[PDB]
Short mmCIF file of N, CA and C and ligand atoms in Angstrom, two decimals:
data_model
loop_
_atom_site.label_atom_id
_atom_site.label_comp_id
_atom_site.label_asym_id
_atom_site.label_seq_id
_atom_site.Cartn_x
_atom_site.Cartn_y
_atom_site.Cartn_z
N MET A 1 0.85 -1.22 0.00
CA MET A 1 0.00 0.00 0.00
C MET A 1 0.88 1.25 0.00
N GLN A 2 0.34 2.35 -0.48
CA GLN A 2 1.08 3.62 -0.55
C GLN A 2 1.00 4.36 0.78
N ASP A 3 2.15 4.92 1.21
CA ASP A 3 2.22 5.64 2.46
C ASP A 3 2.52 7.11 2.17
N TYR A 4 1.49 7.84 1.78
CA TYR A 4 1.72 9.26 1.51
C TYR A 4 1.05 10.07 2.63
N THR A 5 1.47 11.33 2.76
CA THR A 5 0.89 12.21 3.78
C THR A 5 0.08 13.31 3.15
N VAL A 6 -1.10 13.60 3.72
CA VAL A 6 -1.96 14.63 3.21
C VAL A 6 -1.66 15.91 4.04
N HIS A 7 -1.11 16.93 3.42
CA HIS A 7 -0.81 18.19 4.10
C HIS A 7 -1.98 19.15 3.92
N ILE A 8 -2.48 19.68 5.04
CA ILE A 8 -3.63 20.57 4.99
C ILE A 8 -3.26 22.01 5.38
N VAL A 9 -3.73 22.97 4.59
CA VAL A 9 -3.49 24.39 4.88
C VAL A 9 -4.85 25.11 4.76
N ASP A 10 -5.20 25.82 5.81
CA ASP A 10 -6.44 26.62 5.87
C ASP A 10 -6.23 27.79 6.83
N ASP A 11 -6.84 28.92 6.54
CA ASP A 11 -6.69 30.09 7.42
C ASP A 11 -7.65 29.97 8.60
N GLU A 12 -8.82 29.35 8.41
CA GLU A 12 -9.79 29.16 9.47
C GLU A 12 -9.46 27.86 10.21
N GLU A 13 -9.03 27.96 11.47
CA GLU A 13 -8.73 26.74 12.24
C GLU A 13 -9.87 25.72 12.35
N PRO A 14 -11.11 26.17 12.62
CA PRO A 14 -12.20 25.19 12.71
C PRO A 14 -12.41 24.33 11.49
N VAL A 15 -12.28 24.94 10.30
CA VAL A 15 -12.46 24.22 9.03
C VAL A 15 -11.28 23.28 8.81
N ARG A 16 -10.09 23.73 9.18
CA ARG A 16 -8.85 22.97 9.07
C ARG A 16 -8.93 21.70 9.92
N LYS A 17 -9.31 21.86 11.19
CA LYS A 17 -9.42 20.73 12.11
C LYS A 17 -10.51 19.73 11.68
N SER A 18 -11.59 20.24 11.11
CA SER A 18 -12.69 19.42 10.63
C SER A 18 -12.20 18.48 9.53
N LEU A 19 -11.60 19.07 8.49
CA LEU A 19 -11.07 18.29 7.39
C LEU A 19 -10.03 17.29 7.95
N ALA A 20 -9.04 17.80 8.67
CA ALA A 20 -7.97 16.96 9.21
C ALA A 20 -8.53 15.75 9.98
N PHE A 21 -9.44 16.02 10.89
CA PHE A 21 -10.05 14.96 11.69
C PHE A 21 -10.79 13.93 10.85
N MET A 22 -11.50 14.39 9.84
CA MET A 22 -12.27 13.51 8.94
C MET A 22 -11.35 12.58 8.16
N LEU A 23 -10.27 13.14 7.60
CA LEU A 23 -9.30 12.35 6.83
C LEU A 23 -8.61 11.30 7.73
N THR A 24 -8.27 11.68 8.96
CA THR A 24 -7.62 10.72 9.88
C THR A 24 -8.57 9.59 10.31
N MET A 25 -9.85 9.91 10.43
CA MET A 25 -10.85 8.93 10.77
C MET A 25 -11.04 7.98 9.59
N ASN A 26 -10.57 8.40 8.41
CA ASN A 26 -10.65 7.58 7.22
C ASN A 26 -9.34 6.85 6.92
N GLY A 27 -8.41 6.87 7.88
CA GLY A 27 -7.12 6.20 7.70
C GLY A 27 -6.00 6.90 6.95
N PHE A 28 -6.16 8.17 6.60
CA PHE A 28 -5.06 8.86 5.91
C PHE A 28 -4.02 9.36 6.91
N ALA A 29 -2.76 9.45 6.47
CA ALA A 29 -1.73 10.05 7.30
C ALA A 29 -1.97 11.52 6.98
N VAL A 30 -2.16 12.35 8.02
CA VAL A 30 -2.47 13.74 7.84
C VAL A 30 -1.62 14.68 8.66
N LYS A 31 -1.26 15.81 8.10
CA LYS A 31 -0.47 16.81 8.80
C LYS A 31 -1.11 18.19 8.56
N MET A 32 -1.53 18.84 9.65
CA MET A 32 -2.13 20.17 9.61
C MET A 32 -1.07 21.26 9.77
N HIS A 33 -1.08 22.24 8.88
CA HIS A 33 -0.12 23.34 8.99
C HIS A 33 -0.87 24.60 9.46
N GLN A 34 -0.20 25.39 10.28
CA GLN A 34 -0.78 26.59 10.86
C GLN A 34 -1.11 27.71 9.82
N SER A 35 -0.35 27.75 8.72
CA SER A 35 -0.58 28.76 7.70
C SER A 35 0.22 28.41 6.44
N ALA A 36 -0.09 29.10 5.34
CA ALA A 36 0.58 28.89 4.09
C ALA A 36 2.09 29.10 4.23
N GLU A 37 2.48 30.15 4.97
CA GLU A 37 3.90 30.44 5.21
C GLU A 37 4.60 29.29 5.91
N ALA A 38 3.90 28.65 6.86
CA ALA A 38 4.49 27.54 7.61
C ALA A 38 4.69 26.33 6.71
N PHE A 39 3.74 26.10 5.81
CA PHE A 39 3.86 24.96 4.91
C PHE A 39 5.01 25.21 3.92
N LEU A 40 5.14 26.43 3.47
CA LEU A 40 6.17 26.83 2.53
C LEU A 40 7.56 26.60 3.10
N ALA A 41 7.74 26.88 4.41
CA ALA A 41 9.01 26.66 5.10
C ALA A 41 9.23 25.16 5.36
N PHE A 42 8.12 24.41 5.42
CA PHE A 42 8.23 22.97 5.62
C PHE A 42 8.40 22.21 4.30
N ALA A 43 7.91 22.78 3.21
CA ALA A 43 7.92 22.12 1.92
C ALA A 43 9.17 21.42 1.37
N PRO A 44 10.37 21.98 1.57
CA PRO A 44 11.59 21.31 1.07
C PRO A 44 11.78 19.91 1.70
N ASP A 45 11.29 19.75 2.92
CA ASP A 45 11.40 18.47 3.61
C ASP A 45 10.25 17.47 3.30
N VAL A 46 9.25 17.86 2.52
CA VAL A 46 8.15 16.96 2.18
C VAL A 46 8.59 15.82 1.26
N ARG A 47 8.21 14.60 1.61
CA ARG A 47 8.51 13.43 0.77
C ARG A 47 7.20 12.66 0.65
N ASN A 48 6.81 12.35 -0.59
CA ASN A 48 5.62 11.55 -0.83
C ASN A 48 4.43 12.22 -0.13
N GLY A 49 4.23 13.50 -0.44
CA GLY A 49 3.13 14.25 0.16
C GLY A 49 2.22 14.94 -0.83
N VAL A 50 0.94 15.06 -0.47
CA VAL A 50 -0.06 15.73 -1.29
C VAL A 50 -0.51 16.97 -0.46
N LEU A 51 -0.85 18.05 -1.15
CA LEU A 51 -1.31 19.26 -0.45
C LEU A 51 -2.79 19.59 -0.72
N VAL A 52 -3.54 19.90 0.34
CA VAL A 52 -4.92 20.29 0.18
C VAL A 52 -4.93 21.69 0.82
N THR A 53 -5.07 22.71 -0.03
CA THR A 53 -5.04 24.07 0.49
C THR A 53 -6.26 24.92 0.19
N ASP A 54 -6.56 25.82 1.10
CA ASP A 54 -7.68 26.72 0.86
C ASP A 54 -7.19 27.82 -0.08
N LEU A 55 -8.07 28.41 -0.87
CA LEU A 55 -7.62 29.46 -1.80
C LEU A 55 -7.63 30.85 -1.15
N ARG A 56 -8.80 31.30 -0.72
CA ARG A 56 -8.92 32.63 -0.10
C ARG A 56 -8.35 32.68 1.31
N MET A 57 -7.08 33.06 1.43
CA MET A 57 -6.43 33.19 2.73
C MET A 57 -5.74 34.56 2.67
N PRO A 58 -6.18 35.52 3.47
CA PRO A 58 -5.64 36.89 3.52
C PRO A 58 -4.10 37.08 3.43
N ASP A 59 -3.35 36.42 4.33
CA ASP A 59 -1.89 36.56 4.31
C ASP A 59 -1.24 36.08 3.01
N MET A 60 -1.56 34.84 2.63
CA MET A 60 -1.03 34.25 1.38
C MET A 60 -2.14 33.37 0.82
N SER A 61 -2.47 33.61 -0.45
CA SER A 61 -3.53 32.85 -1.11
C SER A 61 -3.09 31.45 -1.51
N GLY A 62 -4.04 30.61 -1.86
CA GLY A 62 -3.72 29.26 -2.28
C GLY A 62 -2.92 29.32 -3.58
N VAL A 63 -3.25 30.28 -4.43
CA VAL A 63 -2.58 30.46 -5.73
C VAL A 63 -1.15 30.91 -5.50
N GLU A 64 -0.97 31.95 -4.70
CA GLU A 64 0.37 32.46 -4.40
C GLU A 64 1.23 31.34 -3.76
N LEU A 65 0.63 30.50 -2.91
CA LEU A 65 1.38 29.39 -2.30
C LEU A 65 1.90 28.49 -3.43
N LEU A 66 1.03 28.16 -4.39
CA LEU A 66 1.39 27.29 -5.51
C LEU A 66 2.50 27.91 -6.37
N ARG A 67 2.51 29.22 -6.53
CA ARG A 67 3.56 29.86 -7.30
C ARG A 67 4.88 29.85 -6.50
N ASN A 68 4.79 30.00 -5.18
CA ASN A 68 6.00 30.00 -4.36
C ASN A 68 6.64 28.60 -4.38
N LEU A 69 5.80 27.58 -4.35
CA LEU A 69 6.30 26.19 -4.36
C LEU A 69 7.05 25.97 -5.66
N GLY A 70 6.51 26.47 -6.76
CA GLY A 70 7.15 26.32 -8.05
C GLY A 70 8.52 26.98 -8.07
N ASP A 71 8.64 28.10 -7.37
CA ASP A 71 9.91 28.82 -7.26
C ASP A 71 10.96 28.03 -6.49
N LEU A 72 10.53 27.17 -5.56
CA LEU A 72 11.42 26.35 -4.78
C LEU A 72 11.88 25.11 -5.54
N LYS A 73 11.53 25.04 -6.82
CA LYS A 73 11.89 23.90 -7.68
C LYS A 73 11.34 22.60 -7.13
N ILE A 74 10.19 22.70 -6.44
CA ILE A 74 9.50 21.59 -5.80
C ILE A 74 8.12 21.35 -6.42
N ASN A 75 7.74 20.09 -6.60
CA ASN A 75 6.45 19.73 -7.15
C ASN A 75 5.69 18.87 -6.15
N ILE A 76 4.62 19.43 -5.59
CA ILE A 76 3.79 18.69 -4.63
C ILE A 76 2.37 18.74 -5.21
N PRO A 77 1.80 17.57 -5.56
CA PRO A 77 0.45 17.50 -6.13
C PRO A 77 -0.47 18.27 -5.19
N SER A 78 -1.26 19.17 -5.75
CA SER A 78 -2.17 19.98 -4.93
C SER A 78 -3.63 19.96 -5.36
N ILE A 79 -4.50 20.06 -4.36
CA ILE A 79 -5.94 20.12 -4.55
C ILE A 79 -6.23 21.50 -3.94
N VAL A 80 -6.98 22.35 -4.64
CA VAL A 80 -7.28 23.67 -4.08
C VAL A 80 -8.79 23.76 -3.77
N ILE A 81 -9.10 24.11 -2.52
CA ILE A 81 -10.49 24.26 -2.11
C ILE A 81 -10.88 25.72 -2.37
N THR A 82 -11.90 25.93 -3.20
CA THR A 82 -12.29 27.29 -3.56
C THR A 82 -13.65 27.65 -2.98
N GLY A 83 -13.86 28.93 -2.77
CA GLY A 83 -15.11 29.45 -2.23
C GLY A 83 -16.31 29.09 -3.06
N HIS A 84 -17.46 28.95 -2.40
CA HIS A 84 -18.70 28.61 -3.05
C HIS A 84 -18.99 29.52 -4.23
N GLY A 85 -19.17 28.92 -5.41
CA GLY A 85 -19.47 29.68 -6.61
C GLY A 85 -18.44 30.71 -7.05
N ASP A 86 -17.19 30.53 -6.64
CA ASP A 86 -16.11 31.47 -7.01
C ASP A 86 -15.36 30.90 -8.24
N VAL A 87 -15.81 31.30 -9.42
CA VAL A 87 -15.22 30.84 -10.68
C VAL A 87 -13.79 31.34 -10.95
N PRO A 88 -13.50 32.65 -10.76
CA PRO A 88 -12.16 33.19 -11.00
C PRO A 88 -11.10 32.44 -10.22
N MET A 89 -11.40 32.12 -8.98
CA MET A 89 -10.46 31.38 -8.12
C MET A 89 -10.18 29.97 -8.65
N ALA A 90 -11.19 29.23 -9.06
CA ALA A 90 -10.97 27.88 -9.56
C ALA A 90 -10.13 27.90 -10.84
N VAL A 91 -10.46 28.81 -11.73
CA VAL A 91 -9.70 28.94 -13.01
C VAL A 91 -8.22 29.24 -12.76
N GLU A 92 -7.95 30.25 -11.91
CA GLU A 92 -6.58 30.65 -11.58
C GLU A 92 -5.82 29.54 -10.88
N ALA A 93 -6.51 28.77 -10.03
CA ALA A 93 -5.91 27.66 -9.33
C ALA A 93 -5.48 26.60 -10.35
N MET A 94 -6.31 26.29 -11.33
CA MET A 94 -5.95 25.30 -12.33
C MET A 94 -4.79 25.80 -13.21
N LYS A 95 -4.82 27.08 -13.56
CA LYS A 95 -3.75 27.68 -14.36
C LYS A 95 -2.44 27.66 -13.59
N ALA A 96 -2.53 27.69 -12.25
CA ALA A 96 -1.34 27.65 -11.38
C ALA A 96 -0.78 26.25 -11.16
N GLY A 97 -1.35 25.23 -11.80
CA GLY A 97 -0.82 23.88 -11.66
C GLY A 97 -1.48 22.90 -10.68
N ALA A 98 -2.58 23.32 -10.09
CA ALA A 98 -3.30 22.44 -9.16
C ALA A 98 -3.78 21.21 -9.93
N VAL A 99 -3.77 20.05 -9.27
CA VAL A 99 -4.23 18.81 -9.85
C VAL A 99 -5.74 18.90 -10.03
N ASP A 100 -6.40 19.59 -9.12
CA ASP A 100 -7.84 19.79 -9.18
C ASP A 100 -8.28 20.81 -8.15
N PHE A 101 -9.54 21.26 -8.29
CA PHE A 101 -10.13 22.20 -7.36
C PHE A 101 -11.34 21.44 -6.78
N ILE A 102 -11.79 21.91 -5.61
CA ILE A 102 -12.95 21.37 -4.94
C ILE A 102 -13.72 22.61 -4.43
N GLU A 103 -15.00 22.65 -4.74
CA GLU A 103 -15.87 23.75 -4.34
C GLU A 103 -16.51 23.35 -3.02
N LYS A 104 -16.42 24.25 -2.04
CA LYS A 104 -17.03 24.00 -0.73
C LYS A 104 -18.47 24.63 -0.69
N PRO A 105 -19.36 24.04 0.11
CA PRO A 105 -19.19 22.84 0.96
C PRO A 105 -19.01 21.64 0.04
N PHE A 106 -18.35 20.60 0.52
CA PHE A 106 -18.11 19.39 -0.25
C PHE A 106 -18.38 18.13 0.56
N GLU A 107 -18.63 17.03 -0.14
CA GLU A 107 -18.89 15.73 0.50
C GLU A 107 -17.54 15.08 0.77
N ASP A 108 -17.38 14.48 1.95
CA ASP A 108 -16.14 13.82 2.31
C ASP A 108 -15.67 12.87 1.20
N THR A 109 -16.64 12.11 0.68
CA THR A 109 -16.39 11.15 -0.39
C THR A 109 -15.71 11.79 -1.58
N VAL A 110 -16.08 13.03 -1.87
CA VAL A 110 -15.57 13.77 -2.99
C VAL A 110 -14.13 14.26 -2.73
N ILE A 111 -13.91 14.88 -1.58
CA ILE A 111 -12.54 15.30 -1.29
C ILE A 111 -11.63 14.07 -1.17
N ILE A 112 -12.13 12.98 -0.59
CA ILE A 112 -11.33 11.76 -0.50
C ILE A 112 -10.96 11.24 -1.89
N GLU A 113 -11.89 11.32 -2.84
CA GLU A 113 -11.59 10.88 -4.20
C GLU A 113 -10.55 11.83 -4.86
N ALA A 114 -10.71 13.14 -4.63
CA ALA A 114 -9.78 14.11 -5.17
C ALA A 114 -8.36 13.87 -4.66
N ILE A 115 -8.24 13.53 -3.36
CA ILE A 115 -6.94 13.27 -2.78
C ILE A 115 -6.28 12.03 -3.43
N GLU A 116 -7.05 10.93 -3.53
CA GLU A 116 -6.58 9.69 -4.18
C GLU A 116 -6.08 9.99 -5.60
N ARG A 117 -6.73 10.92 -6.29
CA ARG A 117 -6.37 11.33 -7.64
C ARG A 117 -5.01 12.02 -7.66
N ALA A 118 -4.82 12.96 -6.72
CA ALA A 118 -3.58 13.70 -6.61
C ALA A 118 -2.40 12.76 -6.30
N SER A 119 -2.66 11.76 -5.48
CA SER A 119 -1.64 10.77 -5.14
C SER A 119 -1.15 10.03 -6.41
N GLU A 120 -1.94 10.03 -7.48
CA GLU A 120 -1.57 9.38 -8.73
C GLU A 120 -0.32 10.06 -9.29
N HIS A 121 -0.14 11.32 -8.94
CA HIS A 121 0.97 12.16 -9.38
C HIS A 121 2.27 11.97 -8.62
N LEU A 122 2.25 11.22 -7.53
CA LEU A 122 3.44 10.99 -6.77
C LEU A 122 4.30 10.04 -7.59
N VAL A 123 5.62 10.32 -7.66
CA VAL A 123 6.54 9.48 -8.42
C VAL A 123 6.54 8.03 -7.90
MN1 MN B 201 -10.46 30.95 3.56
#
């Protein structure tokens, strides 16, 4: 079986803990990051990891995070969670290299399938 880690980034702690807890209850190895900046500083050390990030985050957006990762010469399959009915954000996220976007609110089954898909990109 594959042993990958799901890295979660969200500006709202309650939403972050909700997702994290749900994925762990489903058997995924999960790591919650305090902010986009914290994940960016942790990124060089990631091995066999997938990223699930929120898009609208005041300090650093999900898109900007994706562009910074690219600058670090690092490729981490990413799923971007976008605001309800926010088309500009989903489009920009895909143009930025995200494996896929997920519109919230979302069904656990759906985010779980999106994560399994991103893991397809792990070498
Ligand atoms: Mn947000």
